[PDB]
């Protein structure tokens, strides 16, 4: 997994890959690792995938309760406190390692949330097994208050470095560009990896498989 996020002049660019591994086998080639939290806040997820899924769904639900009650657009620090207090309550056993980005009334805010419950409010964060490659790209080329497309190229470059340099990362680059005026959930943003064209042909025609019994059941 390589997930990454920056803060540019007008907002948040989040990024992720799409490879899910079960062991050292690519199980899903097109996993969606950028998760809805609120209409202004998304969250990238790494760690135990079921933990990040159910964790982000519960906190997305609680921000929906919260913003229905307040009638306001929810803050990124509210999602931050909910995430870090539940992950500290569960003693680090829910392995939800999360990149929390969003734009609210106080501006663009970016968070990285560790499974034990510690948070970092940073202009650029990366997580996953391919996090150090992407942080090498960020420490190489980050400028404060970039343009939108400079930040998109930077985050796609960080995710691409994690893809090509880490075995647990690959197959596509997703982005989520967040600002005050929009929400560009770019899935996919880049396809770096194409499957090689099949040179042969393996269409096993009708009658190739021997059948012992057959039960046809018609439907309505």
């Amino acid at each position: 997994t390589t997930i990454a996020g920056v803060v540019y002049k007008d907002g948040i660019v989040l990024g992720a890959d799409t490879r899910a591994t079960e062991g050292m086998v690519v199980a899903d080639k097109n996993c969606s690792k950028i998760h809805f939290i609120s209409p202004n806040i998304y969250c990238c997820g790494a760690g135990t995938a079921a933990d990040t899924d159910m964790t982000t769904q519960l906190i997305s639900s609680n921000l929906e309760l919260h913003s229905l009650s307040t009638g306001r657009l929810p803050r990124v620090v509210t999602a931050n406190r909910m995430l870090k207090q539940m992950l500290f309550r569960y003693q680090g056993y829910i392995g939800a390692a999360l990149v929390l980005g969003g734009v609210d009334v106080t501006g663009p805010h970016l968070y990285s949330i560790y499974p034990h419950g510690s948070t970092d409010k940073l202009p650029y964060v990366t997580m996953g097994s391919g996090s150090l490659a992407a942080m090498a790209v960020f420490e190489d080329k980050f400028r404060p208050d970039m343009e939108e497309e400079e930040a998109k190229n930077l985050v796609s470059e960080a995710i691409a470095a994690g893809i090509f340099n880490d075995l647990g990362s690959g197959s596509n680059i997703d982005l989520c560009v967040i600002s005050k005026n929009k929400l560009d959930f770019l899935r996919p943003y880049t396809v770096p990896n194409k499957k090689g064209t099949r040179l042969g042909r393996y269409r096993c025609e009708k009658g190739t498989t021997a059948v012992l019994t057959e039960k046809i059941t018609p439907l309505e």
């Binding site: 870090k84 207090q85 992950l87 500290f88 680090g92 560790y114 034990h116 419950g117 510690s118 948070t119």
Partner: peptide
């Protein structure tokens, strides 16, 4: 110390 502990 532990960052989660100190922030909590």
């Amino acid at each position: 110390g532990s960052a989660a502990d100190t922030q909590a």
